[PDB]
Enzyme design. Structure first.
Site, PDB file in Angstrom:
ATOM      1  N   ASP A   6      60.104  19.016   9.612  1.00 22.23           N
ATOM      2  CA  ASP A   6      58.487  19.234   9.419  1.00 22.23           C
ATOM      3  C   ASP A   6      57.520  20.159   9.652  1.00 22.23           C
ATOM      4  OD1 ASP A   6      56.912  19.977  12.484  1.00 22.23           O
ATOM      5  OD2 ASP A   6      57.483  17.283  13.188  1.00 22.23           O
ATOM      6  N   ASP A  58      56.592  28.178  12.262  1.00 17.61           N
ATOM      7  CA  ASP A  58      57.005  26.626  12.625  1.00 17.61           C
ATOM      8  C   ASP A  58      58.579  27.190  12.738  1.00 17.61           C
ATOM      9  OD1 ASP A  58      58.245  26.686  15.555  1.00 17.61           O
ATOM     10  OD2 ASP A  58      57.092  24.208  15.158  1.00 17.61           O
ATOM     11  N   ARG A  79      64.819  22.851  15.609  1.00 12.89           N
ATOM     12  CA  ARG A  79      64.346  21.161  15.807  1.00 12.89           C
ATOM     13  C   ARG A  79      63.490  20.816  14.580  1.00 12.89           C
ATOM     14  NH1 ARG A  79      61.659  25.315  18.600  1.00 12.89           N
ATOM     15  NH2 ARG A  79      59.654  26.019  17.794  1.00 12.89           N
ATOM     16  N   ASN A  80      62.873  21.404  13.514  1.00 11.58           N
ATOM     17  CA  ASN A  80      62.086  21.634  12.940  1.00 11.58           C
ATOM     18  C   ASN A  80      62.592  21.282  11.030  1.00 11.58           C
ATOM     19  OD1 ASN A  80      60.449  21.206  14.188  1.00 11.58           O
ATOM     20  ND2 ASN A  80      59.250  23.334  14.252  1.00 11.58           N
TER      21      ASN A  80
HETATM   22  C1  LIG Z   1      60.209  12.773  11.357  1.00  2.98           C
HETATM   23  C2  LIG Z   1      61.313  12.737  11.614  1.00  2.98           C
HETATM   24  O1  LIG Z   1      62.290  12.417  10.244  1.00  2.98           O
HETATM   25  C3  LIG Z   1      63.771  12.664  10.381  1.00  2.98           C
HETATM   26  C4  LIG Z   1      64.658  12.575  11.149  1.00  2.98           C
HETATM   27  C5  LIG Z   1      65.796  11.701  11.092  1.00  2.98           C
HETATM   28  C6  LIG Z   1      66.320  11.282   9.666  1.00  2.98           C
HETATM   29  N1  LIG Z   1      65.278  11.446   8.905  1.00  2.98           N
HETATM   30  C7  LIG Z   1      64.126  11.971   9.134  1.00  2.98           C
HETATM   31  N2  LIG Z   1      63.495  12.385   7.761  1.00  2.98           N
HETATM   32  C8  LIG Z   1      66.827  11.745  11.710  1.00  2.98           C
HETATM   33  C9  LIG Z   1      66.549  13.268  13.269  1.00  2.98           C
HETATM   34  N3  LIG Z   1      67.997  12.233  14.075  1.00  2.98           N
HETATM   35  N4  LIG Z   1      68.254  11.235  13.798  1.00  2.98           N
HETATM   36  C10 LIG Z   1      70.006  10.448  14.198  1.00  2.98           C
HETATM   37  C11 LIG Z   1      67.535  11.088  12.063  1.00  2.98           C
HETATM   38  C12 LIG Z   1      68.585   9.828  11.112  1.00  2.98           C
HETATM   39  N5  LIG Z   1      69.132   9.247  10.665  1.00  2.98           N
HETATM   40  C13 LIG Z   1      65.898  13.668  14.271  1.00  2.98           C
HETATM   41  N6  LIG Z   1      64.653  12.869  14.783  1.00  2.98           N
HETATM   42  C14 LIG Z   1      64.502  11.787  15.700  1.00  2.98           C
HETATM   43  C15 LIG Z   1      63.007  13.448  13.980  1.00  2.98           C
HETATM   44  O2  LIG Z   1      61.854  12.703  14.979  1.00  2.98           O
HETATM   45  C16 LIG Z   1      62.919  14.600  13.493  1.00  2.98           C
HETATM   46  C17 LIG Z   1      63.396  15.494  13.616  1.00  2.98           C
HETATM   47  C18 LIG Z   1      62.924  17.380  13.046  1.00  2.98           C
HETATM   48  C19 LIG Z   1      62.867  17.004  11.987  1.00  2.98           C
HETATM   49  F1  LIG Z   1      62.034  17.917  11.290  1.00  2.98           F
HETATM   50  C20 LIG Z   1      62.075  15.971  11.670  1.00  2.98           C
HETATM   51  C21 LIG Z   1      62.394  14.423  11.931  1.00  2.98           C
END
Ligand SMILES: C[C@H]1Oc2cc(cnc2N)-c2c(nn(C)c2C#N)CN(C)C(=O)c2ccc(F)cc21
Length: 292
Positions: free
Chosen positions: A167, A146, A150-151
């Site tokens: 992700d 995937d 978004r990931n």
């Molecule tokens: C599991 C999560 O991980 C993180 C999210 C963020 C930062 N660092 C990490 N590790 C983050 C996000 N937005 N913002 C403003 C911040 C901040 N600071 C994105 N988000 C809400 C997600 O859920 C998400 C989306 C995609 C993905 F690949 C992993 C994740």
């Protein structure tokens, strides 16, 4: 408890670095399971498993921790550790202050107020970063399944940003769902027709990610539904170039979208092509569109 094998080693939950819950403080929501900014002082993102989820959700959550914890590469988010001995269960990840790539592209689009917010080289550097992560996965025989904006995550908003794959939930589900939830717009024909996945699956998806990047965060196949895309792609249909997209960059996309997987480039070749694009003044001097 479930085991997991990566490279030449097998791992279990006992191998995850347990962080005492008393050492963890939530600071704010980041855009919810739910995800928080936290402190361990080490700054972290806290991925949480809702207590109201089932046993399969628990195992999936756990497997994702195992997966990320065993990677070691600059363009894959680090796992700081877990907190599994208290509820709700936590996974602690490298805090990526730039947020997810799709939201970043959409919010950082050059505007009359911010005409120089982003240039072609910045986009090429993001693409290179993720391709480097994908090359690491390919060379270690891990299929992501995937790859999509978004990931992906960014270390920071500003010029020094580094993009990483953040992700691994889809590779986790297949490792152990619905049709309308499949990321069909990122999948090659043999994937959505035969359920066949190889490294060349990720090549196709990376081509779609490239389109996302150079379109500045548009949804792939504008105006088309999932089923319409399935029929379109199977019949040979491909997306047009994003607005102002340089030919050499679009050429990488169309190579990623070759019908036969054997005709698509591996990530070493993709990286070489992205690097040549960064060298070409006619590519990097191309102005991105300024939406009014
Ligand atoms: C599991 C999560 O991980 C993180 C999210 C963020 C930062 N660092 C990490 N590790 C983050 C996000 N937005 N913002 C403003 C911040 C901040 N600071 C994105 N988000 C809400 C997600 O859920 C998400 C989306 C995609 C993905 F690949 C992993 C994740």
């Amino acid at each position: 408890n479930p085991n997991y094998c990566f490279a030449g080693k097998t791992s279990s939950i006992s191998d995850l670095k347990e962080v005492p819950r008393k050492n963890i403080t939530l600071i704010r929501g980041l855009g919810h399971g739910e995800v928080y900014e936290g402190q361990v002082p080490l700054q972290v993102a806290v991925k949480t498993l809702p207590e109201v989820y089932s046993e399969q959700d628990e195992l999936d959550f756990l497997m994702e921790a195992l997966i990320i914890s065993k990677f070691n590469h600059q363009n894959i988010v680090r796992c700081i550790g877990v907190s599994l001995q208290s509820l709700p269960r936590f996974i602690l990840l490298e805090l990526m202050a730039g947020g997810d790539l799709k939201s970043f592209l959409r919010e950082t689009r050059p505007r009359p107020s911010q005409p120089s917010s982003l240039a072609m080289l910045d986009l090429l550097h993001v693409a290179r970063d993720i391709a480097c992560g994908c090359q690491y996965l390919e060379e270690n025989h891990f299929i992501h399944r995937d790859i999509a904006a978004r990931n992906c995550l960014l270390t920071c908003p500003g010029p020094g940003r580094v993009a990483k794959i953040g992700d691994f939930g889809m590779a986790r589900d297949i490792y152990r769902g619905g049709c309308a939830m499949l990321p069909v717009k990122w999948m090659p024909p043999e994937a959505f027709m035969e359920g066949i996945f190889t490294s060349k699956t990720d090549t196709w998806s990376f081509g779609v990610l490239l389109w996302e990047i150079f379109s500045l965060g548009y949804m792939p196949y504008p105006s088309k539904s999932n089923q319409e895309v399935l029929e379109f792609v199977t019949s040979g249909g491909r997306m047009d170039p994003p607005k102002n997209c340089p030919g050499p960059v679009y050429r990488i996309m169309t190579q990623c979208w070759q019908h036969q997987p054997e005709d698509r480039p591996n990530f070493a070749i993709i990286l070489e092509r992205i690097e040549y694009c960064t060298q070409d003044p006619d590519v990097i001097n191309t102005a991105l569109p300024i939406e009014y």
